[PDB]
Amino acid sequence: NQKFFTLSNGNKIPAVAVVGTGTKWYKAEETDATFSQELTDIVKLSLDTVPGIVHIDAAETYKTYPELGAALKETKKPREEIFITDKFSSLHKISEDPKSALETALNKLGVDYVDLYLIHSPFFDKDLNIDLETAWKQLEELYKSGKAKNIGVSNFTVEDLKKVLAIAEIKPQVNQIEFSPFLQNQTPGIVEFSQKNDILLEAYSPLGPLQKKPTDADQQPFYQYLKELSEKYNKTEAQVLLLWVYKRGILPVTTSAKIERIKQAQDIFSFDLTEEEVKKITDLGLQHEPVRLWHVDFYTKYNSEAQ
């Protein structure tokens, strides 16, 4: 049965997100010509066939609101069985500010509210005429009005979170970071700090080890063990890694275009990992060199602390 995290405000969030935009699907422009029927079809199929509350991870920067909106309109999946996470594009500006971004997104998606709204990066485009404090306060207002049921941030360091906490009326509920066995602290100490402060981590690119699965995998203890666990449980290697993230108290966010992988990700709560297994994945992961797929130009300088 489906598992949930409970945020600091008591609200529940499905403990895996399975509908996302993979890299192949990002768009540079949003026109009739660039509308992706293939993406809308996979989102619709997911909403139609994936059991339970389907957690969608969207973002302004992807320019895939039209495809999500068309799928949301065409499915009979009820709104209450969908959890929509959306993100203000701060690194490269599309809107003037979060309230503008979210109002535009709500309309394109054809919904009245999102379930979670994030600031996508702490590194604000020079062309934005708003600072972090002012942007957070806009999220606080979207929370108070109910346009965003929950609010948080993405790719924030400990120092960035502290800046928010110093000005916040509403404490951020989520920090979505890159997290995998090969990147166990996106920036120094972030996992421990977030968990101690009741800020839920989400992990994007949690399957980094399988995306970058190397030629000599069969001679690496990490991949040997991962295969062993897959065989033990009769589950995919991806499922084992996603479940490991959940067992670390973190919400894995995945972005497959393959419906059976999407269903498999939703179904991670069909099994469990023992305490020993969680610790062993952790430990073998930490022995591996870091793999970082996002915010590379900003955070490579932290790779020495990531494991």
Q: Within 13 Å and on the Cβ side, how many CA atoms surround 290?
A: 20
Q: Could you tell me which residues come within 8 angstroms of residue 127 by beta carbon, excluding any fewer than 6 positions away?
A: 93
Give the resolution value in Å.
Answer: 1.5
Name the binding residues for substrate. 120
Picking from 169, 139, 158, the residue whose alpha carbon sits closest to that of residue 196 is 158
Name the binding residues. 120
The answer to whether 152 touches 185, Cβ cutoff 8 Å, is no
Domain coordinates in residue numbering, the chain = 4-306
Q: Which of 26, 62, 113, 117 is catalytic?
A: 62
4-306 maps to CATH 3.40.630.30: no
Active site residue 223: no
Query: At CA 263, angle to CA 108 and CA 119, rounded to 5?
Result: 40
The answer to whether 19 touches 256, Cβ cutoff 8 Å, is no
DSSP string covering the chain: ---EEE-TTS-EEES-B-B---GGG--S--SGGG--HHHHHHHHHHHHHS-S-EEEE--GGGT-HHHHHHHHHH----GGGEEEEEEE-TTTTSSSSHHHHHHHHHHHHT-S-BSEEEE--SS--TT----HHHHHHHHHHHHHHTSBSSEEEES--HHHHHHHHHH-SSPP-EEEEE-BTTBS-SSTTHHHHHHHTT-EEEEESTTHHHHT--TTGGGSHHHHHHHHHHHHHT--HHHHHHHHHHHTT-EEE---S-HHHHHHHHGGGGS---HHHHHHHHHHHHHSPP---SSHHHHGGGHHHH-
